[PDB]
Amino acid sequence: GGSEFQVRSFEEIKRSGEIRIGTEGAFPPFNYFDERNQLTGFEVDLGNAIAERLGLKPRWIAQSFDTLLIQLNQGRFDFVIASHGITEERARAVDFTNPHYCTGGVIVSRKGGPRTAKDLQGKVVGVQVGTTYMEAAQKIPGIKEVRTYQRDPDALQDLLAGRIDTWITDRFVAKEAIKERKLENTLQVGELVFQERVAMAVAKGNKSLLDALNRALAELMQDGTYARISQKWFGEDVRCK
């Protein structure tokens, strides 16, 4: 169907009455397509709450993770909410909001496998393209091979199939994958490889929208909306401390 690409200021957005939100749709329980193929998750609930507070109809676009920030800067959407940890490198190309959650990257292996970064000496480590996991895997010494996947759930599948020794992913993502697939007795979560603060992105320089997102997120944090949505997905409050 195609769409009109434009980096829009908040005033232009407000004038149209709708806001375009980019996400991935392959990172359960943050953003994913459910069993009746509808987009949902923590970040989808958060984005819709933000849109509602701002008085705007949300329009969601799911696309592959590796080009979300690319297509954001090209004008495909107004902001992205797709679990991006804030990094110096990414901040050169997009502006981040205040983080909407805090989390960490974690080692996951089959029951007898690697627990610590040092255990990764000589091992095959699967990670998703363009992630902070692939960043940290490239910097852990003595890994035999970093295998990079287009989608995070496919790295998990290669771990289950015994084609890699370890999968590095988000701690909440690993937690829920194991539960929902009943792999408590087959997978083992190891140590936290790093910690990160995860934020929404807008196109480099889009301060007016950045301001409006930061104001809405603060209100959701203060008025109880954030707390309900976090409790809904995690049974705990995941905001940054």
Ligand SMILES: N[C@@H](CCCC[NH3+])C(=O)O
């Ligand atoms: N939090 C990680 C993963 C993002 C989502 C990848 N499916 C990162 O910032 O790279």
